[PDB]
Subunit: 254 residues, 2 copies
């Protein structure tokens, strides 16, 4: 009886996997070779499923506990884990013979990296990416996603976040390119232009990047103008990492 892996369906692709949050863990399970089954739940189901299986919320907010995916339940140990970074630490230690993604000496720098990456990338992607992922959600997730996200933006309709060919959208793209530009700098800060943070071996930091990057690719569309422009950034560095992880960019069709 294998790992239970929870995920939100979308219509961007045939295999239904789009979310950057879950793709970090999907990459992580795939790269570790750990077998798992996928359980597909809608955005408004996430809290309800989490209470059913004993998943901790990932943040406390004035509204109460706030539940997100990825979540895995390990019947082999009875433990349920939320937040892809906690998942990763869990998989590392519960399955020591798999490729380790967070070497202990680098654990706290990985925690610092997650904040750095959240500040540089995640907030920049949102004005373009959230309206776009709303458009490929199932209707029941779309009603929930549009409502909560529009509310979180102080009431601004999704259609007005960054409409195409507008100046708003151009400045959002500019801010996204500048974020990835810093990661490029981090990856070359000592004269060695790396694709992987540790040099030669895969780390969870690399998985974080391709998790969020594959989201842009699959939801904006591989054949879209904006994605084809993305793969030319920083002489193709992000396309190249995607390439390096392509053999783990798979939904085993659970």
């Amino acid at each position: 009886n294998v790992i239970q892996f929870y995920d939100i369906p979308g219509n961007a692709t045939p295999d239904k996997a789009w979310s950057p949050n879950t793709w970090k863990t999907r990459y992580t399970l795939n790269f570790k070779g750990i077998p798992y089954k996928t359980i597909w739940v809608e955005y408004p189901d996430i809290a309800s499923v989490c209470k059913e299986i004993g998943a901790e919320p990932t943040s406390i907010r004035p509204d109460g506990p706030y539940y997100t995916l990825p979540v895995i339940h390990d019947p082999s140990t009875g433990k349920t884990i939320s937040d892809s970074a906690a998942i990763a630490r869990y998989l590392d230690k519960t399955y020591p013979d798999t490729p380790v993604v967070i070497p202990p000496e680098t654990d706290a720098l990985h925690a610092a990296f997650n904040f750095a990456f959240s500040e540089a990338i995640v907030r920049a992607l949102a004005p373009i990416m959230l309206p776009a992922t709303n458009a490929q959600l199932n209707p029941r997730s779309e009603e929930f996603f549009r409502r909560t996200r529009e509310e979180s933006a102080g009431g601004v309709k999704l259609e007005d976040w960054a409409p195409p060919g507008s100046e708003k959208r151009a400045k959002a793209w500019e801010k996204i390119r500048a974020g990835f530009g810093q990661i490029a700098k981090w990856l070359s800060a000592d004269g060695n232009d790396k694709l992987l943070f540790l040099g030669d071996k895969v780390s969870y930091a690399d998985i974080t990047i391709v998790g969020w990057v594959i989201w842009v690719k699959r939801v904006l569309g591989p054949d879209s103008a904006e994605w084809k422009d993305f793969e030319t950034w920083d002489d193709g560095k992000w396309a190249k990492q995607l390439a390096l992880f392509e053999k783990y960019e798979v939904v085993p069709d659970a």
Copy 2:
């Protein structure tokens, strides 16, 4: 004939050493054990001295190149390095038999940490700490520091930034405490509460923190109420890092 180390004098301590940026490099030269001579440079001469010695600016804006300290000149090599993170890497690579501060597998993660730290700490300190450091500058640096910093703040004078007993100053502290609270969580993210990022070995990331903390301690004053409160934060975690480095908190005397 030894390393020349350029630093900004101040009056907070008999050492005349106060800067957060230069203490990062002072700490690094003390911990690596490299002899050096200190050359004291006033704020308005920094650009002028950098040109004489051929130092790189640390940023370029439409205003032209922007020069900052720390800078070192190594007559053993003829090279001049600026920016404390680049000093650290140069010292690693030129004196390989000294204790390494940026182990190569951590180099990109360090560069990411620098960003995370700047986002979490440096801008939170500024409203309290920049006026404090102005009040202890020599008059030539004070004219320069006050004028440029106030202008960069749309004109509001230093004494109104976060005045004592104001709500501004209280909100500033709250933001500063939350900033260090993220560092604390990074340092215990795997359940193991560390004082050093790599666990048992000192790294440049540790040096980065004590650089900025010793600035707060020396400039606000070891016996200020705000500082005595600071060392109770996070079960005294920051005080403990200071203690661990005390044997390197020295201006080597000449």
